[PDB]
């Protein structure tokens, strides 16, 4: 009855070997080469901040590394600390707890130490009533470079938020680094979805993956484990309805489970990923039906951003030092490389002109969706007026101060037209100054889009870009894209009562008690739908889509169709008003 | 002398077997199939959040499940934890309490654990002065997936509000799920009203139910127990007036109680349901007298919403997997089903035009009343200006952020005409953006109604719908509906002094001391009432209703009526000014 899963040695963060290699350079090295500790008498960097969003976990990775070092280091011992249980009313009780763990690691052979919950065991000094915080932070710092060196042991602070630490722990000398976990996206997603399927001795459908790792996103690894559990008991139900309606404890035939794709989709629908438990994510891929009316522009637009932002991937420095040249002993050769990607851009800013309901923010979530691993936020009023305890312009500086953090980062505003009427003049001037407060040498997108087409844009829009390459113009969808948009429906109508689960009354199930021990009628409508919409906005096709879907939801059990079109065309007629 | 009631094994949440089955899949399974714990070596989901409004209870359901597992599992033991008594000044006292319960469940056979009051025993870390919260939350999380697995025991957090937990408990790995209790409405209401009548060995009138479960709504189960108690002692009084005016302790004849419907109605009037102890509920069914003047439109309107919202009931996935097809091993068949109910709607929004006092908000509470189990709130100034510590637009984002929570949900505004003059331009722009901030693929009603008929609507109204199918037009009531409205009164006048309890002087009661051990005169008025109102608003008939009711309240003891009509017609005459 185990709870916890059994994928260890960096098998729970499966799909991400780059940070694995990055860490195996640092904790692994002091115990790899002790000879250079006086041949070159320095401190090889030890101490890792496990950090990242919950759902990835911060602790499963701990025993991940623990198995990545246990047999890798013959031999190394382990010291595990979880939860904020290093307190007391005595300044010396919390003192001696960490001191005891320290010396017992010192009274040990080559060893390592695990700080889960550094935020609780090492919170910020609130020096007004609680000054055991002073003692615990001072002694944890002295265990690194105070009265006690880092020795041949290593410290690993498990962290979930960056606001629960004073700026005395993630500095060099204690950990020297920061480790973030980026939510293995698709095929790293594939490895983390298949590792949990490594548990089924009977063969499970995972070859069909990555058709399951598509929609698995934002769950970390623990929630993917929730996914496999849910699909599991889904298959349980699909096997045995003797679970309910069965009173006495009983038995089975001793080999029972067979998983169905349906069970996977069951588990798929019932739960939600981690970024959105109560906050919607601003990045989401385009729906397939928007594709025949949106990819045409989206390709050009993403091309253009790749132009103004040639960053689209993550460059591994491991592979850089994997391929070196002998033509490097100087800086002017280095000055070549620094010149590029630094002098190659000017102030990435972008806006979109278009009509209301003209695909506005239909691409919005997806353009972030086409590339990740990038610094982001929104200047949207959801977070602008989110702040209550600080002024609105204080919010401005706080978000621009998030961007103060050097990163290829993103300003994100969709349909700014409502914006700049939300805020006072002073907020406008604030944002404008902060834009001027930035240098062209830095690489950060400024992203906006408007429900007002150009030539009528706000006076704050007509100057912030003032260039074709700082703006995208949008038009109406072409007829030929449209007919593809209404393409599938025109045949879904003529295969309904069998291709959809509404033409068939559902199949009854039976299970034993398991004895207990204890056409040409269509083309006119085809011409009808067209030429009644030429000039219609994007949303209006959505309206008609929904309506005709209602029609077919009704006709789901109809046979010999092409007699069911009248409601379609009449809905067309009524729609025009 | 027992307090607590005696309906157990999910007999206190009677009327709701769906969540019963849902939970019996999860806690019941790890102890049902321990063989798949290494044949497939996963953690069957254990840990339930009892959650829902008080009145349903959170704890009676606990022993409900306790009896649904005690004999169902031969054998299982139980560990019950109630109240926030797992604190101390020592970080280790609270530590060892939960640790002791954990191991004693570990030093036990197959067992379960009950967390009542998880909000108190597991509140949020306030990391400024109280950091035993860190210890208790960390150890409760480690009891699941820390130093101690969930084992063969299960955890049940009893919760009353969702704001008393940090986002580290309702995640997968501890409970993995959330359980809400929807207030068994009518016939689930019937089972919960009859289960308390299961206590009377003498036969009680409950066959007349569900004429008692009609008006029982919003009481959960405990308040229905209050209802049966109150009707009980009502029948007590109806039996014995020797309760008062009786000094010495005394005795009876040893079989005494006989319940009357009157006692039920006594209990009915004296108390209030749970949703409204100090907050009125916005959903209430139509009064019967509004029916002859409102059902005609209400039918069409609810039809229309069913069109724009085909959701009207709750689909059980248990029955889905109860009927599966062999024609499912792919996703395009799945893509069929996902296409429907996702692409079948466009942005459910609705408005009503009509006159002041034209039935405005007479249907308002009832249109929610005709269908439940749906996500709701109001944009009414009661909650708009309710907020004091956050800005008004902050309130906007907070409510739109409640809707951020994915649900088939409801925007509710009655008589918006006053609205949009309440708020600044910025609130308007906020709501409008947030409307644009939503995608058509999502299924959420936008609901409004106006005291201004169309063609004179606010400029914010004339565009937010701009379609016949986004709006309902209202007219005056037809004469024939009216005459039915004044139908019953025309005969109530002519059967007064016996059909009503005002023509008879009430009957005296006596009880022994119980010896102690220690016409044609009418039709003119019928034509009078009509043709003096043709064009009159809805409320005006209400006025006349009240007035004539005063008349008859006076004439309650009159005999040989049709001589009492003059006051009626003269009230008509005076009314016109």
Numbering used by the authors:
A (entry chain C), B (entry chain B): 256 to 773, 1128 to 1186
Relevant lines from the article:
ATAD2 (also termed ANCCA) is a histone chaperone that has been implicated in nucleosome density regulation by histone H3–H4 loading or removal. Although histone chaperones responsible for nucleosome assembly and disassembly usually do not contain ATPase domains, ATAD2 is unique because it is the only known AAA+ ATPase histone chaperone. Here, we demonstrate ATP-dependent histone H3–H4 deposition onto DNA by Abo1, the fission yeast ortholog of ATAD2, using an in vitro single-molecule imaging technique, the DNA curtain. We solve the cryo-EM structures of Abo1 in three different nucleotide states (apo, ADP, and ATP), revealing a major reorganization of the AAA+ domains from an open spiral to a closed ring—a structural change that can also be recapitulated in real time by high-speed atomic force microscopy (HS-AFM).
In addition, we determined two cryo-EM structures in apo-states. One structure was determined to 4.3 Å resolution, which is similar in resolution to ADP-Abo1. The other structure that showed clear features of the bromodomain was determined to 6.9 Å resolution from data collected using a Volta phase plate. Therefore, we used the 4.3 Å resolution structure of apo-Abo1 for comparing with ATP- or ADP- bound states, and referred to the lower resolution structure of apo-Abo1 for describing the bromodomain. Especially in the low resolution cryo-EM structure of the apo-state, six lobes of density that match the expected dimensions of a bromodomain were arranged in a hexameric ring around a central lobe of density. On the outer face of the bromodomain ring, characteristic helical densities that run diagonal to the central ring axis could be observed. In addition, we also observed an extra density at the center of the bromodomains, although it is unclear whether this is part of Abo1 or a bound substrate. In most asymmetric states, only one blade disappeared from the field of view, but there were also rare transient cases where two blades of the ring disappeared simultaneously. These HS-AFM results were highly consistent with our cryo-EM structures that show a closed symmetric ring for apo- and ADP states and an open spiral in the ATP-state. The “hole” is formed by the AAA1 HBD, AAA2 HBD, and a linker that proceeds the AAA2 HBD. This unique addition, which we name the “linker arm”, stabilizes the hexameric conformation and explains how Abo1, in contrast to other AAA+ ATPases, can exist as a stable hexamer even in the absence of nucleotide.
